[model samples]
Target: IVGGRRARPHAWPFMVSLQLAGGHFCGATLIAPNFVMSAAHCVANVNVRAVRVVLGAHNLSRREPTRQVFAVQRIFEDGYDPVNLLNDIVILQLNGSATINANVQVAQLPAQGRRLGNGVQCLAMGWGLLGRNRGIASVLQELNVTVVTSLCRRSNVCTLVRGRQAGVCFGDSGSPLVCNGLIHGIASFVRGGCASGLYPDAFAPVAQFVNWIDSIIQ
Candidate 1:
């Protein structure tokens, strides 16, 4: 735990590992009772039938219950003719809510009107390469990050803030940018490419969709 929050070894388990055969992957949030939000590009092509949602997990090494697999019941993409950049959000509804327990926890969604100011701290996690494309890291890793203004003007980097603690890389796409124990943004894209600028990695800005989401799962 960084700020009185639980550490990776003993953190809430609702955040899951979405596995795909082709190796392409990203992050997601356990919203509502049985749904998760992530980047649409992550699930491109292959139907939900080909993907697996692993829940109640901490360490990936341990198999079985630590990795409960669920089929994607329905996938809700943001919209048609969407900007390849903005609103890369998507929602996945499981056939049913996986049995949640102390090991599993639903991540908190961003409150309406909530704005992550410059230099604010947030958490980013993923199963992507450890250092660039050097290699993929092992199960459930986390690093501290900060909020910055969009820096897309001067460089490929869209985020204003920068930190060495953690970053959203290759597979980390669609992951959560959590803070204050609440869901702030989905690790949608990185500046350039998995650490480069230009892509200026961006998230879904969950606070803006609170009402729309509430109506769906309520």
Candidate 2:
């Protein structure tokens, strides 16, 4: 997130770090005991074995006892359209089941066709770059954003929160956009260099693929 703050531990238990070779590059969410949700672009061209899912973690630098890590066994990305960023979501099947407890749990998926009106308050969480001169955050970052439909096409939309800066950026790809206690979007792309409050961040809507998700996980 470009403008964000440290998130409370387990506040978004479903939040996950999608690590490539042990380094966090994108965010994901535990949608089921053995499945995690993320953006298709985040795992594109990446080797499955090199991908790891870190759950129940609030900080990226230090290991916490509550944390659980899983190797990716399989990746299923929706029929993707790279030209316009359509269907930019993916599901990761874990090699072993996640041990769900107080610090780890699944997030609820949005109902099919569910839509929130403009200006609805929502949140986006990740460990993405914090802006110029600041590197990727070591701790999870959370931002309050509002929904808007102007810039997005297909089953996607934009989000923005005013600040010195606002919107998602590098390392936030695949992070969930939570609204009304349901995951509504997945961080997809951003206009400009993550500093534009004028250009809201783009996201892939979760409601558009809820049926696809349910069919695959079952």
Candidate 3:
């Protein structure tokens, strides 16, 4: 969200605001009526009972009728390696199913083994901090980033957004990376600050873990 502009209301319905008692800290995608997908790192070390997911909200502070909040009933993390930060994905089962409406929708997951060609332009949305202000955006923010390559044994997608100020920042972890109308990545981390070029923002590619995700929800 750093260096990005405010996204239109209800434009990305699948985007979820992952919040703790403090405030919104991460982003997630609604993959099913009762399940949301996010980065394990975002949930790691946190009490599941203390975390909640806010869906269908364009602004974090406003009480929009479209917004629905859910208590996290459970969390499931990938069994893959974490030292390298591979398989950073996690699934959270909501206490109740979200009501399907115009401002609330599920995101489509990419097919297994789908290959994203380098240089493909993708979209990333979240309520993460804007580099200029160092404060989390009250409204959803989105930016365009290009596929650079794969890393961590192809378990993560590396992306490079234009501008030294552009890229993921604090509070953006677990945000969905969309390409060609499908969910392809989950924001994991950026090697450097939002202004640094080394260690471009990396994401947990959804296509690489579709089976793992299906196994959990089903």
Candidate 4:
């Protein structure tokens, strides 16, 4: 969210605020009525009691009628590699189903094993930091980026990110990369620098884990 604008209020119904007791730690997507998806590092080794997911929110700290906080009943992460951040997906089973309406819903995942070709346009959404050494935005921010097939690996999606003032600070991890109405990737990392444009912005390709995602949600 380093250089993106404030998202039209609740335009992203599936956007989630993955919060620890102290504050917003990462972003997520409500992919099911009772399930949310996030980054493995966000919850791995964390205290269960301190983690929660906030839905239907625009401003993180402001009171909004559509906002709903839910307890995480269980956190599931498998085959996540910390060293390379491979398969960095994490799913959280909610205590109960979310009441979906104008401000809340589920992510539309691509068909299992679907592949996104290079140069596909996508939108990356998150409430992460505004810039290098800047503070995190309480209001959600979004950036438009194109897929970089040249830099992509089997498990990762790379994007050419540089909106002048824009970049994907690592704090945006776990956010959704929506393309053609489908959740194609999850915010994972950037090159060596945040929005430096030297290294491409990177993500965990969701298509790589649809089977794993389906098995747990089922």
Per lDDT, the best of the predicted structures is 2
TM-score of each: 0.83, 0.96, 0.94, 0.95
For residues 1-218, could you state the per-residue lDDT of candidate 3 as single tens digits? 88678898899989999889949988999999999999988888787788989999998887788889998998888674567787889999999999988988999998878878788999988888887358888999898988887443366787887555688888889999999999999998787666465556888889988888888877
Can you write out model 4's per-residue Cα lDDT over 1-218, one digit (the tens) per residue? 87788899989999999888758888899999999998887787778677888999998888788988998998788789999889899999999899989899888898888888878888988988888888899888988888877866777888776446466785688899999989998898877677776667778888878888999998
In Å, residue 109's CA in model 4 sits off its true spot by: 0.1
Writing each residue's lDDT as its tens digit, candidate 2 over 1-218 gives 87788898779999999888779988998999999999999888778778889999998898689989998888787788888788999999999898989889899988888887889999998999888447999888898999887776657767878555777879899999999889999999988678676777888889989999999888
Residue pairs with clashing backbones, model 4? 3-166
At residue 154, give the lDDT of candidate 1.
21
Candidate number with greatest TM-score: 2
Off by over 4 Å in 2: none
* Model 1 CA deviation exceeding 4 Å by range: 1-7, 22-24, 80-83, 152-166, 196-200
What's the lDDT for residue 54 in model 2? 93
lDDT by residue (85-116, candidate 1, tens digit) is 56667888887786766766777776665777
Predictions in order: lDDT: 0.63, 0.87, 0.85, 0.85
